[PDB]
Amino acid sequence: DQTSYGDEIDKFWLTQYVIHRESYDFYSVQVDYTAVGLMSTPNVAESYQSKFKGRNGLDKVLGDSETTRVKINSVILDKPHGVATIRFTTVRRVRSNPVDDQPQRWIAIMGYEYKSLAMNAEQRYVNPLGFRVTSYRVNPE
Q: Which stretch binds ligand AO4 (CB under 6 A): 17-25, 72-80, 81-89, 106-114?
A: 17-25
Q: Enumerate residues 23-42 that contact ligand AO4 by CB under 6 A.
A: 24, 32
Residue 22's binding partner among ligand AO4, its own copies, none (Cβ under 5 to 8 angstroms by kind) is: ligand AO4
Torsion of CA 119, 123, 126, 131, to 10 degrees: -40
**Shortest Å distance, C-beta 132 to ligand AO4:** 17
Beta strands in 3-130 (DSSP E): 66-78, 83-94, 104-114
Regarding 22 and contact with ligand AO4 (CB under 6 A), the answer is: yes
Binding to ligand AO4 by CB under 6 A, coded x per residue (else -) over 57-86, reads: -----------x------------------
The sign of the torsion formed by the CA atoms of 48, 49, 54, 60 equals: positive
Please give the Cα distance from 108 to 123 (Å, whole number): 25
18-26, 38-46, 75-83, 127-135 -> range binding ligand AO4 (CB under 6 A): 18-26
Burial track 108-134 (b if 16+ CB lie within 10 A, e otherwise): bebbbbbeeeeeeeebeebbeebbbbb
Tell me if 51 contacts ligand AO4 by CB under 6 A: yes
Q: Please report whether residue 123 would count as binding its own copies according to CB under 8 A.
A: no
